Structure formats: C-alpha cells, structure tokens
C-alpha cells in the first residue's frame, strides 16, 4: 500500500500514510479533514488518560458556548477569527465569533463565581472543537482550521499554588507525549516574544520532527498571573477582609499530538502505533486457502481471543472471508497494529502461533501457553523501544554549540541547535529576519524553548556578545 | 438566593430557571439561546454519554469527527432559516458562505459513497459526538431547546434492509436505556406518523417522555430507518457477491443534552433538583455539624475516614468542610442540587460511632453505624434510583387518558394528560386535528401525535378512528408538545 520513503519525500510519505491507513479523509473545506475511526481512536485513548489525569487534581469538565459577541472578544489573531453573519437569509443584528478560544467567555463568568476564598481553587476544563482561519499551510493534525482539543483553566488565591499547577500540568502532557504516544519532549519556558503575551510566564513541551529539522510546540501551560484577573475583575476577599486579585493558569493540547505520534514513529511501511494506545493491540490471522481445515484454524483463533483478552490485551480476529491472508498483512501492517498473530494448519498441531512485531519485523514461535506473558512482554518492548530510538533520534538533531556561524551548517543538517543566550528582546527578531536572510539565499530560526534542564553556564551570547544568560534550544518550527 | 421559592405545580417556568441556577447546573449568557453547563450538568452529561458509547462500541459502532463546517453547495445538495453562515474570516470575505453544522448528513454521506464500492465494505456502523448549530425560531429553553446544543449522530450503513432495522430497534432501546437505566425517566417506544418522521426516512422510531407540570409531550430520541433514499441521492452503492450494483439500508439516530432536562424536569419537587444516584456528580455529601472557629479535628478526621472507606466501596463522595456556613444551611444547599444522599456527623454521632442519613427524594432519616455505612448506602441509592423511575412511571401513566370520541379531547388536554385514541392514521386528518385543536384553545396549543406506541393496547373489533369515523388501525400518543 505505501510507495513513498520517509527519508525522501516527507510531506508525501505523511499524506499517503494517514490516507491509506484510513486515518485521514480529505474534505472540501481547506484546512479541515475528517478523522476516521482508526485516528479517532487514538484521540479518544489520550483524552481518557488526561482527563482521568486532571479529574485526580480536582479539574472538572464543563462545556461553554462556542459563540462569543463582538464587542466580548473585541476588548496576528483577528485575521484568523471566524464570523458568523447570518441565520438563513437573515442578518444577524450584530455579527458573531466561532471561539478561537475561551478566554472572552470564561473569564466574566469566573468574576461572578468568585467572591470569597472559599470559592478557590476554580479549576475546570472543556474538551471542545475550536476554529482559527489558520494563515499558514495546513497539515493534517499539526495545523488544522478546525481541531479539537482541550483547554484548561484555573484560578488560585496565590502565584506559589497556580505555579505548582503549572508544572503538574506540564508533567501530564509530558505523558501524554512520552507515556502514551512514545515520543520524547523537552520541557522548558518560552522567550518574553514566544510566550503568550496575555500571561507572565508560559511553559511548554517541545518535540522534534527530524525528517525537516522542525521543532514543534507539543502542549503549553501558562502561569497567567494577575493580568487577566484585573482585565474582568475576577477579585476575591480573603480571611482577613481584603480585596485581591486571583492568580491564574490556562493550558491547552489538541490532535496535534496524533500528527507527532504518525511522524515519530511511522516507517516507509506506514504507521506504527504504540501499544498502549492502540486500539487493536494484537490482531489475529487465520491462514486459510485450498479449504485445509477451514474449521479447525477458526475455533483456535476464538480459544486465543478469550484467552489474550484475561490479559486485557486488545485483540481483533480478522476474520473476513473477503479478503485474503497476505492482503490482511499489509493492511494491519499499514494500520500499524503492533503485534500480528499469523496462524495456518503447520501451526495447528504445531501447538504454536507466528507472531511478528511490526516494528522490527522480527518473528518469533511462540507456544499458546506461553503467548499472554510474552506478548506482555513484547508490547512492552515494543512500546519502550519507539520511545528510546525516538529519544535518541532527537538528540542527534540537536547540535549545542556555542557561537552564530554554527547555526546555518546545523540547520542545513535539519537539526536544532542549543545556544548560550542574553535572553534580549531585540536578538531574537533579528535572529529571524537574519536566519531568514540567509535561507532565502541559500526559513526562520526562532527561539522552541529555555529548557528546563540547564547545562552548566561557565560565557557569552552566541549573537550578541553579551554575557550570556541560559541555554535556549532554537531551530526552524511549525 | 439560597433556596428554591417558586412551586413547582404552580410557578412551573420559575421553578425550572432556578433550580437549573442556583443548584449551578447553568450559568446565563448573552447570546440568546446558548448557555453555560457547568459541572455539576455536565458531570450527568459525562456520565450518560460513557454509557451510550460503551454500548454502541459492543455493538461494532466506531467513533469518528467530521467537520463542523460545510459548503453552501454540498449542503443545499436537495430547515434553511435556521442554518448559521459563516462569511468573514477576520476583515476578509469567503469565496461562499460555510454553513455550521446542523447535522451531519451532508457532510458525511458523500464520505460514504467514497469508502463503500463493494459488499465487504458493509456493514459501515460510525457516530459522533460534537456540538451542533441551529437558530431556533421558537422559545430556546436550557437544555431542552437551545441554539447550541451537545449530541451524538449515528448514521450507518447496511447491505440488507432487515439488518438495518434490527440496529435501528437496537439503538433505540439504548436511548430507552439511557434515558430510563441512566436518568430514571421513563419513556415510550413508538413509531413516528408520516406527518412527523423524518421526511428523508422509510420509517422513523422514537422514544417519547412526558412532562405532567405543564401536559407537554416531548421526543428523548430518534431512530430512523432511512431506507435507500439517501444512498439513491448521494450515489451510495456497493457492487454485492454476483458483481450488481445495490443501493445500500441506512439507519440514522440521534439524543442530545435535552436528556439532562428532562431528567431534572421528572425528579424535581420543591426544593429544587433531586438527582438519581447513576448521574450525580456527588452521591453522598457529608456534612460534619461544626460552627464559626470550632475546629478540634475530631469531627473533620472522622469524616476524611469515612470518605475513604465509601471511596473504596466507589461511592462518589464530598466533605463539605466549610467555615462561614451553618449545617442547616449546607443541608438546603446541597438539597437544591439534589444530592440523593446526606451524611450527617456530629459530636452526638462521633459519640455513637453512628451516622445519621438523609435521603434527597423522601427525605426519611436512617441511623447507620460505621461499620455498615457502605453496604447500607449501596443499598440505599439502588432504592432512591428505582423509586424515583417508579413513581414517574406511574405519573407518566397517569397522564394518559384513552379516549373513543374527538370530544375527549379538549377536556383531557385541560387537564394538561395527554391522549391515547384509535386513530385510522391516513394523513389530511393529523394537519386537520392540529389545526382544529389549534383554534379550539384560543377559544378557551396544538396536538399532534407524538407516537404509535410499540406497546398497543388492546383494540376491540370493529373499532372506530376516534376523529374520522373510518376504520381505526391502531392506538396513536397524542398531546401538546415541545
Ligand atoms: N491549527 C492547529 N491545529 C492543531 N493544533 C494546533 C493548531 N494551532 C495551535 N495548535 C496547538 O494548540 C496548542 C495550544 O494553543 P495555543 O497555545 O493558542 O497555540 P498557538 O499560540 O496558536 N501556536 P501557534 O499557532 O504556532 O502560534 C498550541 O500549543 C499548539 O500546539
Ligand atoms: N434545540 C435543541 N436543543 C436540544 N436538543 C434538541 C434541539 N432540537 C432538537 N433536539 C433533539 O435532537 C434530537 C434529534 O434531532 P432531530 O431529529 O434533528 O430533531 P428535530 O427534528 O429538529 N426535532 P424538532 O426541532 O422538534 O422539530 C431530536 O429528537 C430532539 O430531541
Ligand atoms: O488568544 C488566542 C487567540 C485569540 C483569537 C484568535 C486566535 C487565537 N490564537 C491563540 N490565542 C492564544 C491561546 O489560545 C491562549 C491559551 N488559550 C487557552 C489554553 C491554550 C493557550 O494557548
Ligand atoms: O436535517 C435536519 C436539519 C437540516 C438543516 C437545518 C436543521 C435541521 N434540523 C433537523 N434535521 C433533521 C435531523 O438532522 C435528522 C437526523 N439528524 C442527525 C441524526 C438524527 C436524525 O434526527
Ligand atoms: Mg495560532
Ligand atoms: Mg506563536
Ligand atoms: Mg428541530
Ligand atoms: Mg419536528
């Protein structure tokens, strides 16, 4: 099924892979696709691991209006905004926005509910769709007009406890990432001109694309501070009678996440799809041609099911007489299943089953008895595996070094760079218009993070000259 | 304020909108028939939609998203007034205006004629979730009726007719489920008339509810066995086993947020909402019996121990361990939101090693020890849950009065009952019996039929259509509606 190299031509290796899985429908609409059951699937595993994440925080869910009035939301984003205008043939008396997201329609609310101490923490949630009339080009998942997600928002009575929210959230999403999906992250903060200018401080969680030495923003948690707050008046009275501001945080991930996962993990073969999120763990094969024993393959095959699913291991009998065993290969193979379960008359009284992990490719004998536990222990292998040669390859494609004229060699090599910074306003415009300079001549270089995990600072700004203040990983993005 | 004053029998409206508020279910909005659901719904929410989606997973039922958006031509392919447009992205104008979802049928079935070419493509069995848009012309009402509302559309796809029909009936015991198992309401399973199915359909299934504080039929769900009409429209074909090219059986079928409701509607009473324990967020709250600056832990530690105990036996549980409030203030508070069960603990219980309970629904008192709290309140809540579907079957049948003759009607619709009659069921007649009912009360508020109830009653020989005199066929639900 799939004929284009992921090594070669990478946006056409993407496209046939989400299509011929059947992850992805194109639609009529630019900038929208439909998700098929085999992608949403995927949706739906990570959205229960989060939720059941944040409900162990005492987050609860909501649901707000996806309209917002003019005059709210009107108090680089209004280009992308949606307007409804009419109903029928009628006009609206006053035109309407899509939400691009909540804040204008959460926030007045949240200064109604707060009044007193003994009303925070306020911390909800919403999973819902959201719309921005996206600028640059789409991509199925990555950059969509229409995406799903999550938003989160709370409100505290001090910075110290929205902070600790903060990094809890932070974590979650790195699980999200590198729990769920196999697929390393780099947490850190966003540059005063990276961060979302609403908030004091926004962290993030950065992943790798090394197929175009693309970084791209995994997830986000921001410490909003007071700002916001003093903008709607969301004021509480504390114990001992005074006025004060709350204290804030929002965080949001969408179906990126999957557009990450397809890109980390898929090979020239197609999809290959964690274990632990896969909705078909192991499926299983019944070899069956020239009628040799018809019956007695089948029976086996539901004796396994019943057995493997004791396990709680997701199993599917592909057991359609339309279509032939090597066609069920490629599908499942193109599918990404994780584990297929191949079994023919020479394994019947063989007492055995063939098994190939999709992947490596390698093949193993594997006695019914001994299947559950080592198929436990494959999936296992399986899903550790994806996330360390991941980690590795992420690390190859960051270069630390430590002055400007290493940056165009290692971004021509499709890889990030690490680099001693003053953290200066100004450098990084003119990083940009500068990187832009030279690719145009030969993609803009911006600031992806400030990690979190600072190597030591004996040193001076790899651009300015300046003393530099921290490491800050920067390449070109999405 | 604190409580609920208006009377639920006599200040009907008044008493929805403040239960619905200060129980904080929902919270206003300015835009006119859209409102916010805030935890405490939606938590009910969450809940019937597990169960819906667990279901129709063993069913072989898969979850998709399509797109909210929809081209003006692929959605005018063949309502109007009440579709949203889409024309401006920022300052800029769109080619053509892009509708909002209204459902998703236009958007999805040419996907269908794209993925189905051939009989092992069949059964195809998709749903989803998601929000969608319609400018209602009448009276938005929270929940029941509102501009946005939250919803699962299922639309498959058969090779025979029969199979199609068994899921159709399948998914609409689900909604029977959802709405009786879930929200203890009770519900009808009936047949559509040809006045009010779905016109793109063979046959409509429904499941009606009843609401007795104002005589109000009103439709919980739908399920449609649309028949080959759409797969002729939007060229859905599969070539079948001998290589011939059929028209595939498609089922439709829909339930949204209306189900919290209606829910809220049946179970209320004059202190305001009464939530059974499948759905509520909280199923027991405990209430320690403390005051202003009293605070020796005594009291609050017992109640964390017992919290943890009734956790391990998965009781959803809150302590309500606030300081500038009365117990007999937290009581009403959390009666307002309908919490089934109250666990009182005071220095007196702490003294007993004994719990005092108070059940939301008949408010009788139980006194506990410790030890038995979670095996007893187990029991308990499977109590309130079925006593609260029992006694609203009994008034929803209570509320119908079969009748012979046309002239039971206005009588039985004053006394806001609705109406089960022979009805012959050809067509001009329901348009006339609207009309005619229509005039009839604004001499002194329209019926029309709600279903041809599955469960017919008996009907004697020779029988007469209760409004034309023809021959009747069968018993029709009649009454006012939503
Ligand atoms: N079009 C899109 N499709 C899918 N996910 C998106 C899209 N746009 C943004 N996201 C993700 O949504 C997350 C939270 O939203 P937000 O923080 O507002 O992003 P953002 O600032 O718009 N990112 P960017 O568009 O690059 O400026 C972002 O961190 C992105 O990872
Ligand atoms: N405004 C609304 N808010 C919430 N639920 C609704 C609303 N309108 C319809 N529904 C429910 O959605 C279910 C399935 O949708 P659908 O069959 O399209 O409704 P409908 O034909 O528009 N009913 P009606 O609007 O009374 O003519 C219906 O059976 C209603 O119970
Ligand atoms: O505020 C906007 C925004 C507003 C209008 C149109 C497009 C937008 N795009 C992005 N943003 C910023 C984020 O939406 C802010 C914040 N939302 C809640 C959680 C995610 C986080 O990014
Ligand atoms: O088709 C429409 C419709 C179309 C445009 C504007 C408003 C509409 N209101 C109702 N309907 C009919 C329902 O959509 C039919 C169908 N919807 C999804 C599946 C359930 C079934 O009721
Ligand atoms: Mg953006
Ligand atoms: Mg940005
Ligand atoms: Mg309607
Ligand atoms: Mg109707």
Do not use: H
């Given at each position: 099924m799939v004929t284009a190299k992921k090594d070669e031509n990478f946006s056409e290796w993407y496209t046939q892979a989400i299509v011929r899985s059947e992850m992805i429908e194109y639609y009529d609409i630019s900038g929208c696709y439909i998700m098929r059951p085999w992608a949403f699937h995927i949706w739906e595993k990570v959205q229960r691991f989060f939720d059941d994440e944040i409900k162990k925080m005492g987050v609860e869910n909501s649901y707000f209006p996806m309209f917002v009035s003019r005059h709210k939301l009107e108090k680089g984003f209004s280009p992308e905004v949606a307007w409804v205008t009419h109903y029928g043939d009628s006009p609206?008396?006053?035109?309407?926005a899509i939400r691009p997201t909540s804040e204008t329609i959460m926030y007045p609310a949240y200064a109604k509910w707060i009044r007193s101490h003994r009303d925070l923490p306020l911390k909800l949630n919403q999973?819902?769709?959201?719309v921005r009339w996206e600028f640059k080009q789409p991509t199925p998942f990555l950059r969509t007009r229409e995406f799903l997600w999550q938003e989160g928002h709370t409100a505290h009575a001090t910075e110290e406890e929205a902070w600790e929210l903060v990094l809890d959230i932070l974590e979650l999403y790195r699980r999200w990432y590198e729990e769920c999906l196999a697929v390393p992250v780099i947490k850190g903060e966003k540059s005063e001109g990276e961060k979302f200018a609403g908030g004091?401080?926004?962290?993030?969680?950065?992943?790798?694309?090394?197929?175009?030495?693309?970084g791209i923003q995994a997830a986000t948690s921001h410490l909003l501070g007071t700002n916001f707050?003093?903008?709607?008046?969301?004021?509480?009275?504390?114990?001992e009678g005074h006025k004060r501001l709350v204290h804030q945080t929002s965080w949001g991930c969408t179906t990126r996440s999957l557009?990450?996962?397809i890109m980390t993990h898929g090979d020239d073969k197609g999809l290959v799809i964690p274990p632990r999120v896969a909705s078909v763990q192991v499926v299983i094969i019944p070899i069956l041609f020239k009628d040799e024993n018809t019956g007695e393959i089948l029976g086996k095959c539901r004796e396994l099911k019943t057995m493997l699913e004791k396990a709680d291991i997701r199993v599917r009998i592909d057991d359609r007489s339309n279509y032939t065993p090597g066609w069920k290969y490629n599908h499942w193979e193109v599918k990404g299943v994780p584990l297929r379960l191949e079994l023919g008359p020479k394994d019947l009284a063989?007492?055995?089953?063939?098994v190939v992990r999709r992947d490596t490719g390698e093949a193993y004998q594997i006695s019914w008895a001994?299947?559950?536990?080592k198929?436990?222990?494959?999936?296992?292998?399986?899903?550790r595996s994806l996330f360390e040669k991941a980690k590795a390859r992420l690390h190859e494609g960051i270069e630390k070094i430590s002055t400007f004229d290493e940056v165009m060699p290692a971004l021509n090599r499709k890889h990030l760079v690490l680099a001693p910074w003053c953290e200066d306003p100004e450098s990084e415009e003119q990083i940009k218009k500068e990187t832009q300079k030279l690719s145009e001549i030969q993609g803009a270089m911006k600031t992806l993070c400030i990690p979190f995990d600072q190597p030591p600072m004996p040193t001076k700004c790899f651009y300015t000259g300046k003393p530099a203040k921290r490491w800050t990983l920067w390449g070109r993005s999405y």
């Open positions: 609206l008396p006053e035109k309407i999973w819902c769709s959201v004091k401080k926004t962290t993030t969680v950065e992943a790798f694309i090394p197929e175009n030495g693309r707050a003093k903008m709607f008046e969301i004021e509480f009275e504390d114990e557009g990450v996962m063989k007492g055995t089953a063939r001994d299947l559950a536990p198929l436990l222990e494959l999936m296992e292998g399986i899903q």
